[PDB]
Design a binder for these strands. Structure first.
Ligand SMILES: [Mn+2]
Length: 745
DNA sequence: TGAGGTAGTAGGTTGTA
DNA sequence: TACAACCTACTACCTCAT
């Protein structure tokens, strides 16, 4: 079979315990403690003397070689204390920082094509290689004709163990930069407005974006208080203001919004964050070229890391520190335990389905009792194309026929819909202001003959006249009428095309079409392990000071959605209170008693982004009600990636394979073939439980495979994934009361 | 938004070592 | 205390075959 590994290179040799220098910082300046400026004074001292290292442990600063004791620094003066050999087995993070520093210092001295150093390094974990590595193993600069440049931000993070071995964890991440500035684009007259720009001089954190431009030169005193070049002289930045010439004295001021105030900077400073928005809108053939190189299978970034640690080579400063260029054989050598989870059995109306497409051909497992009466919004210029699209979706859902022709791959009466084209409601709406969208949605929903909305919206692209998607979704979720929507690209795909590449669109339309009205398309025949329900939670933190409240959901040992419940009382901060948990678990016991007449004997509580506190509430609250319970936290977005070795030639891993260490389980849930990227796996953590992670991850993978609004599987499990969707869609959900119909799908 | 995945890029907290 | 993981938002392609 195909085993799995992880982006790790074992350092050949051993890190020996070396002679360091204990430094202490004296509280000279206005700062009371030396803790909050130990990073600041750290990189100041590092900037002092030929870029020599300095490391941070809570009170003792370590340097490897004897720096001369300087006290000329204005806020802080430091003091040498003693010099001794520090033990590696007590100092893990310190010698890890030593190894990352020395591989930085060895990669600085490497040049490619003679003049050009390969890696621009600021002595951190981010090693930006100026020179790419391509598909055909050519380490070549790839620049655009328009000034764009791809680079690949290596992320080292080596850790050392108690014996002395250092393991270099890596992460390829192709980043985006340009040699141009916004002044150079002003020289060819490119429009600077609408540009997410990044100050490489001021390292403030904020979405800096261009405000405007008037005609004042930079050699004139402005609203900052003076001529800004004098403040560049004032900010200990003479080496960057000494350079620019008399034509650059004719630079025109371009101001920038750093999300709290205006900033008046020179345009020779500011460089645009050239996102894929920018690469597409300004040179799209460059984007079509580079998606072979930023969407990247395991073979390609393994080739890159092979080149990377081939370029590191060996370091004699750490006693023959060399790195292997091959991955591991298995993660058992690293500490985890691999394995593959078998696929879940899925059933529909007449029992088992072979694959996730057969449910249209045989029938759905859980239909809601009643009839689903459609109603369609569409653009007024796009009448007949929408007519053919709605005729296609209704013929598919009711009559089992596709563009009139009946076909054996689709069962009849798949959803009990009631849609008569001579009798039902069509409302053409013109693409205009958003209040026209509001009056169109209420002019549909005033008539109580509709149970489901199919709006035809414009595409997610197409900046001119914009989406009617989000105000429609807000109104149809607030009016308690679920809606599945169509971008008009898909409408002419239904009308004009004559092949199955509108039928696949139609498959995901029908799965969403039954998910929105509370039906469940398929379930498991059995969820592994003794279990009666699932509980998924999440909290959201989009910006600073914003804590989205909790959202709960319940499933069963079939995994059908019984209920998703929003708690009523608002929380306090990131970590939630106890009354929210009280009402959530009282209501989840009420809902499971409502749907099965008994209490749960097992409960697997899935969880997104909580800490291990509040667990005593779970302990006493389920000791009073004496159900054995399980709490498993699902970690959504990890920088950790996953590989798969086929006889030394390594590629993407198949879906359903996990790697596990105790309570730490990484698992890839999705299948991605090559030239499309590499699958970004999950991370699974158990805070309290009596179950092994085998049946836990089997539940995890089965609830990846029961996404109820698409033919292909979701990456997240649908407990924490659907709770995460509701925590995204916090204003779509009705507040405080129970519901079955999935709005977000 | 068909629909999910990848990827980027910006931006914040705070948990476990 | 730090700080590496964790979150979050938005686009761009790309393929879906029973
Ligand atoms: Mn949808």
């Amino acid at each position: 079979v195909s085993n799995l590994t992880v982006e790790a290179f074992e350092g050949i040799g051993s890190v020996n315990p070396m002679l360091f220098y204990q430094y202490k910082v004296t509280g000279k300046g206005k700062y009371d403690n030396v803790y909050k400026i130990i990073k600041s004074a750290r990189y100041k001292m590092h900037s002092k003397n030929r870029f020599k290292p300095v490391f941070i442990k809570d009170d003792k600063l370590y340097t490897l070689e004897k720096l001369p004791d300087i006290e000329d620094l204005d806020f802080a003066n430091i003091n040498f204390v003693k010099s001794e050999v520090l033990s590696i087995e007590d100092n893990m993070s310190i010698y890890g920082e030593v190894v990352e520093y020395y591989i930085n210092l060895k990669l600085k001295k490497v040049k490619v094509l003679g003049k050009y150093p390969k890696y621009r390094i600021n002595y951190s974990k981010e090693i930006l290689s100026n020179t790419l590595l391509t598909r055909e193993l050519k380490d070549e600069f790839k620049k655009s004709n328009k000034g764009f440049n791809l680079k690949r931000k290596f992320r080292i993070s080596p850790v050392v163990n108690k014996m002395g071995k250092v393991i270099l964890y890596l992460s390829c991440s192709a980043d985006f930069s340009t040699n141009k500035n916004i002044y150079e684009m002003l020289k060819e007259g490119l429009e600077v407005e609408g540009l997410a720009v990044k100050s490489e001089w001021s390292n403030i954190s904020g979405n800096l974006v261009i405000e405007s431009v008037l005609e004042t030169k930079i050699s004139e005193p402005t609203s900052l208080g003076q001529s800004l070049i004098d403040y560049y002289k004032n900010n200990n930045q003479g080496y960057r203001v000494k350079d620019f010439t008399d034509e650059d004295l004719n630079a025109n001021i371009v101001n920038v919004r750093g999300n709290k105030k205006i900033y008046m900077y020179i345009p020779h400073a500011l460089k645009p964050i050239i996102t894929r928005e920018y690469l597409a809108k300004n040179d799209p053939e460059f984007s079509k070229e580079i998606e072979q190189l930023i969407k990247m299978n395991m073979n390609y970034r393994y080739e890159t890391l092979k080149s990377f640690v081939n370029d590191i080579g060996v370091i004699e400063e750490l006693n023959n520190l060399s790195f292997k260029n091959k991955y591991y054989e298995d993660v058992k050598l690293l500490g985890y335990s691999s394995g593959k989870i078998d696929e879940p059995v899925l059933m529909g109306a007449k029992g088992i389905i072979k694959n996730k497409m057969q449910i249209f051909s045989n029938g759905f497992y859980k239909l809601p009792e009643g009839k689903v009466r459609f109603g369609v919004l569409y653009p007024k210029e796009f009448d007949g194309v929408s007519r053919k699209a709605i005729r296609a979706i209704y013929d598919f859902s009711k009559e089992g026929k596709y563009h009139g022709e009946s076909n054996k791959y689709i069962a009849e009466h798949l959803i009990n819909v009631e849609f008569n084209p001579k009798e039902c409601i069509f409302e053409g709406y013109e693409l205009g202001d958003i209040t026209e969208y509001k009056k169109a949605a209420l002019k549909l929903n005033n008539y109580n003959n509709v149970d489901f909305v199919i709006a035809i919206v414009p595409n997610m692209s197409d900046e001119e006249i914009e989406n009617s998607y989000n105000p429609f979704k807000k109104i149809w979720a607030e009016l308690n009428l679920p809606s599945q929507m169509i971008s008009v690209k898909t409408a002419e795909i239904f009308a004009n095309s004559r092949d199955n590449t509108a039928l696949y669109y139609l498959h995901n339309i029908v799965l969403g079409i039954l998910g929105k009205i509370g039906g469940i398309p398929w379930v498991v025949k059995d969820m592994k392990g003794d279990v009666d329900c699932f509980v998924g939670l999440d909290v959201g933190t989009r910006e600073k000071g914003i804590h989205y409240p909790a959202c709960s959901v319940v499933f069963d040992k079939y995994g059908k959605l019984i209920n998703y419940y929003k708690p009523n009382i608002p929380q306090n901060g990131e970590k939630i209170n106890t009354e929210i948990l009280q009402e959530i678990f009282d209501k989840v016991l009420i809902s499971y008693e409502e749907e099965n007449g008994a209490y749960p004997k097992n409960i697997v509580i899935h969880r997104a982004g909580f800490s291990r506190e509040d667990l005593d509430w779970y302990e006493n609250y389920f000791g009073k009600k004496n159900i054995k319970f399980n709490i498993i936290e699902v970690k959504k977005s990890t920088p950790l990636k996953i590989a798969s070795i086929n006889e030394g030639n390594i590629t993407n891993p198949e879906k359903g394979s996990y790697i596990l260490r105790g309570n730490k389980a990484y698992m890839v849930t999705t299948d991605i073939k090559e030239n499309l990227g590499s699958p970004k796996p999950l991370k699974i953590e158990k805070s309290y439980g009596d179950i092994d992670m085998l049946t836990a991850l089997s539940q995890i993978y089965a609830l990846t495979q029961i996404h109820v609004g698409a033919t292909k599987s979701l990456r997240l499990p649908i407990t924490t994934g659907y709770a995460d969707k509701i925590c995204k869609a916090i204003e779509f959900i009705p507040q405080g009361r129970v519901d079955n119909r999935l709005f977000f799908l």
